[PDB]
A paper describes a structure:
[name] (gB) refolds between prefusion and postfusion conformations to facilitate herpesvirus entry into host cells. Here we describe stabilization of the prefusion gB ectodomain from herpes simplex virus 1 ([name]-1), determine ectodomain structures at 2.9- to 4.1-Å resolution using cryogenic electron microscopy (cryo-EM) and isolate a prefusion-specific gB-neutralizing antibody termed WS.[name]-1.24. We used structure-based design to identify mutations encoding alterations capable of stabilizing the prefusion conformation of [name]-1 gB and determined both pre- and postfusion gB ectodomain structures. We propose that prefusion [name]-1 gB evades neutralization by most antibodies through an iso-surface display that is coupled to structural plasticity.
Lastly, we introduced cysteine pairs into the interfaces between domains DI and DIV and between domains DI and DV to further stabilize the configuration of these mobile domains in the prefusion conformation. Of the nine tested potential disulfide (DS)-containing constructs, only A240C+E607C expressed. Most of the 3.0-Å-resolved cryo-EM reconstruction of prefusion gB closely resembled the structure modelled using cryo-electron tomography, with the primary structural differences occurring at domain boundaries, such as between residues 501 and 510 at the amino (N)-terminal portion of DIII, where the prefusion structure assumed a random coil that wrapped around the extended C-terminal helix of DII, instead of an extended helix. For prefusion DI, the fusion loops (174–184 and 252–266) should be associated with the viral membrane, but were disordered and not visible in the reconstruction map of the prefusion ectodomain. For prefusion DII, residues 462–473 formed a helix that extended outward from the rest of the domain and pointed away from the viral membrane, but reoriented approximately 90° to form a compacted DII in postfusion gB. Thus, domains DI–DIV each transitioned between pre- and postfusion primarily en bloc, with substantial structural rearrangements occurring only in DV. All visualized glycans were in the top half of the trimer, and a per-atom quantification of glycan shielding revealed much of the trimer apex to be covered or proximal to N-linked glycan. The prefusion conformational stability of gB-Ecto.H516P.L531E.DS enabled us to assess the immunogenicity of the soluble prefusion gB ectodomain.
Residue numbers in the entry:
A (entry chain C), B (entry chain A), C (entry chain B): 109 to 173, 185 to 251, 267 to 473, 501 to 721
């Protein structure tokens, strides 16, 4: 099948997903009162409120012989020139040398400028502009999001707006927080919106909020208030979890969680709050579902479900258990002492608790050791190729990059293969011997959209920048993934296209039945006379670690 | 033990091995009619036909003050001058400025040139040449291979010959395909071959084929026709496979396959073809072998073996099964409804099928999750060090590099440690402060062969190019693997050799009993006065990610 | 919790830890007699003798317009000027032009110089010096270590001293080995030590040894002799090990060992030496502990413990076992042949041994396959980030680097977060457009210690060199780990600090519930006019593999 191509834009940081790090596993099993049981960890219900905002700004530039800046759009212009007439004021106000100054579009007098779409293809971020000195008025319907505090919201651009999205002068608004004074905010009633693409005007009115930042103006529809919801959300249904008591604090460890939770040895009184009814059915029902799936025929339930507030804000709805084999030991000792309630007999018999502590202790330590093995390997992989790691973790193709020690993540735009065309030659005509490293591509986001240039990335990815150039060599032979197959190139010229089934795939880790042959180093004779480099394929880790050494030597030759 | 050294040449791409990529694992178990069973996936019997070909070409060059090219050897020269007299014509024909031109050897008149071996050590690719203007006639007995279509064959050099290896004017040849006209091909009958190493005219004649390409001439013995064989070959014996029905198509998943197969819900009528007897014994016998190994005491066979043609060309000889615990559920419900044949009772009871769908669903999803986890880690490792990844996958030391999105593979020549000698110093006398990074070595492929220079690579690998230079520091202390031990160097000078047992080994992932001590930086005093860089060992990933940053800054200083 | 920071100094190589490499797993199970049993592998008791030595040297330099070298401190100066008066001789003797020459401190006459601590903060390696021409007398109480041979000891600087630490003229000394003549060594009796920090002086005298090297003088207290101890030390308690006989040699394989051991098919007569009692209690007791933990209810002991001397110096105290299911097969055949002693019945019935050979064979091969998969991934990770890999392997934060094919290991100095202060801006004032890549930090090892400059590393690591510069862009937004949270920077200026819980954590490998949004590329307009690079975050693997390509192209433009 012809897989769809993807054009991943660089994330701006609106969504920064941090990723876990290794732990200090115990050298020997020291935690006392070890036990096994089911658990349903609940995360703080952040309640992400997503809405579509609208930014307004004007890019000012100077063409002398140098100075370029961005300015916001005043409220009267948004509500009258843009909202009603669908045009932008030619002039704009900015600051130069700490002095306010007025700007004129292409040294022309004040006139109205019509806003037109930035791209013909349909996109979530519609976008508009007046120009393709220069004062380009820009309007963009970017996305936005808020969280449980609802005190601030982040736009798609990544900049944070220090004001509640529900803020407003109407009743029931989030007036409790606003970092900007009244002169920088305004709310309009009976506001009618009109899409600049169609210009048909809204059918009914809806109050709209407006905010002016030092660099741009923002606006968004004002919803009254999202009704309250349960403060806890099921994060992960732990199929197997072990509780360990050490240092006056419980320690919950599991195989699929990759993290140890610490509590205070006391159950949270969930019955004293309304959450006892919300989580009372979300956790208890899940507990029985997990128990009836694999523990009904091998374990026995011990006591009622226990809720613990772990460090970091997580709530664990633990359910202690014990294997049937261990149950026989407890009942036998109970009969011996009697010469049944496992909730009380648990941990009472020290001679019975000591062996299980080591048995479960090794398992807990084993998980910690292997988890650290995967975490460190996974962490290094993130720094290597965050796109592949981010895509597999989120379950879908996604764009990502390292913003220091945290990962910024943002969805990619899929484009059908019918609109992607690979150029017949990757040789650059403006620089002999310095042609591109990957095939060039020309595509369009949609059938009616224009043809935008680009470059072929890794795993059907499309890059908007054709900057992947290299001192291109002689004897070049490379295969690049293109759709549901590969595009073969030779001597930096398109040779032909082949399907995915035309190449021997080593699918299983071990496949030693390869019909190999001793390759002969048939290199062109120009390598000995013209002294031009020969093809070496994608650089090896030791090669990049070696090429940079030559670079340092080259710099040394210059410093000398 | 003194392990053998290896000299891995760069593969030319004759054998390209694409490698699996991650999948879209289901978020929840949605596939219906889940079941467990044995399976023997069959790949199309490509039938690789390997034979030794022989290339003939002449390297033409000009000595003005510039122009070099390769030309083929005409047929009359191969069959008369080279085959009988064992000599090459001094003159050759090429093309310049779109005009055919003749070339003379060292501006001398036409004469006969004897072909001599290119190397003394016995190698599979024997090779011969006349010279060590200049017209060097070359003859090489490179390897070749063909596949199922038999319409083309690839030489060891990597270039493809668009003609069937069995092609010829004789009866029973593969005349159905040939991309070259009759003027470029010729077949000789009663041809006698004589090895230029011994001039031993053949004792028994064998017809020989000949082809002339735009760059070189090829020749090879013509075999009549390889007899037909079974069209399917056992690719992998799946010890545990799960079949899932979804979207009107089955889905076969396993733990060791790392790939999901899709079919058309209908068994291929294998009994209608001769393959029913070939696979009827190769698959059925393997099915019983796997079942009698681990499933005889815990599972029961359900129905006869089922053959399905999966997407991509694979044929899966599935054998549905079910655990004995699940069998009790089916028979119990059968007796309830009756108030036996599991092939008909399977999937009939929805209440019994629902829990197993979730049970096996997690297992299927678990395999997909971990497989994707390993695939990306493995794929990232391939781009890091394909030699180690290619060697472990194929089960033997192997050369490899990435030709874009596909990996080229070729064997390595093993050389005994007795013939490898490490130089007593890595300091370069032609460049102060810029000495090599790894030890230099001098070796010979054969005991009687000449001593060829080289450099020490990673894991006893021998590199023919001594280009691993770096700005060499002071206070250098490094260990390099050499044979069955290590070669210790100090201040870029050979210090001594130590065995593998002379260094503390971390054989178990976790080994915290290391007798460490707080190292003190006893850097030489010349670092503060001479300002020379101090030893830093092999560059850390963050260091290579930091050193390049300095390069751009250095370039910025130049662009200023 | 606010984790502690760490300042990791570069290891000098005093402790080198080689790490296992991939193996040649069998293609099919060929080993005969595969059995399953417990084992306790013993390593040679290296007996690391750690002691604190003391180096004495003087750094000589010339201030003309160039010549610098290090010289040792004579014995009379150490025992009289430094030991008694606590001062160093201003003059020193060095070699120049192959001629001994005298050096004076700052072209002054002969005078006494007082030794003062190098750092006010308390450290294990105290250190002292006279100066902060120039003759700086230095005294450092570095660490040292010796091993089983006790013929040589290595200092914290990594330099080896070819003399036994127990060497001396007194009775019971290790006079059997000394690579330095009498003129380079001296032992003082009744020596009184006085700490230069407090000129306290000794109350109880202790003999002190002294040795002079070509570059420095060493001294250390002479202990009579460490009494002998058991020659074997428990290295790893194997919970599951399989023995396989092949090629006239046993082959031991396990899951957690990652290495196959080869023996000579004959048990070592441990009862003939005293080790039969030391290991007789250490191995047998451990064997019963492992057996009583998991194998008591499923396996049966076969024969007495067997000790084998494996290749590499390891001793394996194997204990053959067999599952109860296999026991029934043996006893059943025994009864059939009778028409019990498992030690003699084992391997006697070939028909019973053949199936178990394949069963255990796949398990042994499976471990070898997965172990090789992890080894290469782990080895490739070591070359990427040895610090993270070294820390997890040793169980604690540790400094490490690659000294070629071996890894150097050393500890790190922990510093509390209270003494670490992050600078409010990472912008370099001496180089516009080339500001640092990571936040700068100022800290002190202790409260009373001085404030030393530094840079923030990865995972709370503190680097002493502020050389992590890069061409700093615009639109920069990065998060760096700092203590128990993150430090957010924008436009290379300190914005604010946030806790670890303020960022969404992807803890479980699969977390697809991310409240993602399509980020919009809001880039400053100066990118189009000033042509200044935009923020790209930490370089991707494909980016470093691409940025370096531009470097070669840039050099090609210089070479042109
Ligand atoms: C486990 O129990 C301990 C002890 O009760 C908890 O620590 C306590 O946490 C409370 C808040 O829940 C802290 O109160 C606050 O502290 C500071 C002043 O220290 C101030 O911001 C507020 O006015 C308020 O009083 C309290 O100080 C703290 N006590 C101690 C001794 O640490 C801890 O949170 C519990 N942990 C879990 C995971 O439940
Ligand atoms: C599952 O069944 C479907 C439907 O029968 C199979 O798709 C069909 O595959 C045949 C070849 O086996 C296609 O016929 C060929 O198609 C093209 C024109 O479309 C042309 O090259 C030939 O003249 C020939 O007719 C057929 O079009 C195609 N039908 C559809 C609807 O896709 C499919 O291959 C089966 N898959 C498996 C894994 O068995
Ligand atoms: C397995 O058995 C073989 C054969 O007995 C052992 O090899 C032998 O090892 C001894 C030392 O234990 C070698 O003796 C020494 O050899 C050299 C001269 O070759 C010299 O240094 C000494 O004078 C001494 O004689 C002996 O040569 C060697 N024999 C052979 C045939 O290689 C082997 O060590 C045993 N392996 C294990 C793991 O126990
Ligand atoms: C392990 O659990 C036992 C049983 O719950 C704990 O012993 C009890 O501790 C409570 C206080 O936590 C006392 O009131 C009881 O008298 C103790 N005994 C019994 C029989 O309940 C024990 O403290 C736990 N061990 C550790 C190390 O935390
Ligand atoms: C799961 O398997 C059942 C049983 O084979 C399928 O239901 C039968 O489908 C056949 C045609 O394939 C019909 O003739 C039968 O009447 C169906 N019912 C029974 C009781 O046999 C069912 O379609 C499969 N489920 C899915 C989702 O594909
Ligand atoms: C597997 O073990 C059996 C039993 O120890 C070995 O068979 C014995 O071999 C010895 C010599 O090594 C003979 O003296 C005995 O007569 C053999 N039989 C018995 C019952 O002890 C057998 O050699 C081993 N197999 C392999 C392949 O090493
Ligand atoms: C759980 O086990 C009980 C006791 O054997 C049994 O009655 C019940 O049906 C089982 N439930 C499931 C869902 O298997
Ligand atoms: C190819 O596979 C077959 C089994 O299908 C096996 O017997 C043979 O050894 C394999 N070839 C190689 C070279 O490993
Ligand atoms: C398989 O199981 C059957 C039924 O118990 C038994 O008769 C037969 O011997 C078993 N075969 C093997 C190879 O274990
Ligand atoms: C060394 O190993 C022993 C067991 O053999 C253990 O008790 C000890 O703690 C270990 N030492 C260190 C420093 O980890
Ligand atoms: C080991 O098993 C035996 C036999 O069932 C039993 O008597 C003994 O108590 C068990 N020992 C332990 C420590 O579980
Ligand atoms: C978020 O999690 C809920 C269950 O808590 C699930 O129903 C929903 O599909 C998840 N969202 C996504 C986008 O996967």
């Amino acid at each position: 099948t012809d897989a769809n191509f993807y054009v991943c834009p660089p994330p701006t940081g609106a969504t920064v997903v941090q990723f876990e790090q290794p732990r200090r596993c115990p050298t020997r099993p020291e935690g006392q009162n070890y036990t096994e049981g089911i658990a349903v960890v609940f995360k703080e219900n952040i309640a992400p409120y997503k809405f579509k905002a609208t930014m307004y700004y004007k890019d000012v530039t100077v063409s002398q012989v140098i100075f370029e800046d961005r300015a916001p759009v005043p409220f009267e212009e948004v509500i009258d020139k843009i909202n009603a007439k669908g045009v932008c004021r030619s002039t704009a106000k900015y600051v130069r040398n700490n002095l306010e100054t007025t700007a004129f579009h292409r040294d022309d007098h004040e006139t109205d400028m019509e806003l037109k779409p930035a791209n013909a293809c349909t996109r979530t971020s519609r976008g508009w502009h007046t120009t393709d000195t220069t004062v380009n008025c820009i309007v963009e319907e970017v996305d936005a999001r808020s969280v449980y505090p609802y005190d601030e919201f982040v736009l798609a651009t990544g900049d944070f707006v220090y004001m509640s999205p529900f803020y407003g002068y109407r009743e029931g608004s989030h007036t409790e927080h606003t970092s900007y004074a009244a002169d920088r905010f305004k709310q309009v009633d009976g506001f009618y919106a009109r899409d600049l693409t169609t210009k048909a005007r809204a059918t009914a009115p809806t109050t709209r909020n407006l905010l002016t930042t030092p660099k741009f103006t923002v606006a968004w529809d004002w919803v009254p208030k999202r009704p309250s919801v349960c403060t806890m959300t099921k994060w992960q249904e732990v199929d197997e979890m072990l509780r360990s008591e050490y240092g006056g604090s419980f320690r919950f460890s599991s195989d699929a969680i990759s993290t140890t939770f610490t509590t205070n040895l006391t159950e949270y009184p969930l019955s004293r709050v309304d959450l006892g009814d919300c989580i009372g059915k979300d956790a208890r029902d899940a507990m029985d579902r997990i128990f009836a799936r694999r523990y009904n025929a091998t374990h026995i339930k011990v006591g009622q479900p226990q809720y613990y507030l772990a460090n970091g804000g997580f709530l664990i709805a633990y359910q202690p258990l014990l294997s049937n084999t261990l149950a026989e030991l407890y009942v036998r000792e109970h009969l011996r002492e009697q010469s049944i309630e496992f909730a009380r007999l648990q941990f009472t018999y020290n001679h019975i608790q000591r062996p299980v502590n080591d048995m479960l202790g090794r398992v807990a330590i084993a998980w910690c050791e292997e988890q650290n093995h995967e975490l460190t390997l996974w962490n290094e992989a993130r720094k290597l190729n965050p796109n592949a790691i981010a895509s597999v973790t989120v379950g879908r193709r996604v764009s990502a990059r390292m913003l220091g020690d945290v990962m910024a993540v943002s969805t990619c735009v899929p484009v059908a293969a019918d609109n992607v065309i690979v150029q017949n030659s990757m040789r650059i005509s403006s620089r002999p011997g310095a042609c591109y490293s990957r095939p060039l591509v020309s595509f369009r986001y949609c059938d009616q959209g224009p043809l935008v240039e680009g470059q072929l990335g890794e795993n059907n990815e499309l890059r908007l920048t054709r900057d992947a150039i290299e001192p291109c060599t002689v004897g070049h032979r490379r295969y690049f993934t293109f759709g549901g197959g590969y595009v073969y190139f030779e001597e930096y010229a398109y040779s032909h296209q082949l399907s995915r089934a035309d190449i021997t795939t080593v699918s299983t880790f071990i496949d030693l039945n390869i019909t190999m042959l001793e390759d002969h180093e048939f290199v062109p004779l120009e390598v000995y006379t013209r002294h031009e480099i020969k093809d070496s394929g994608l650089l090896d880790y030791t090669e990049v670690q070696r090429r940079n050494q030559l670079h340092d030597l080259r710099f040394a030759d210059i410093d000398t």
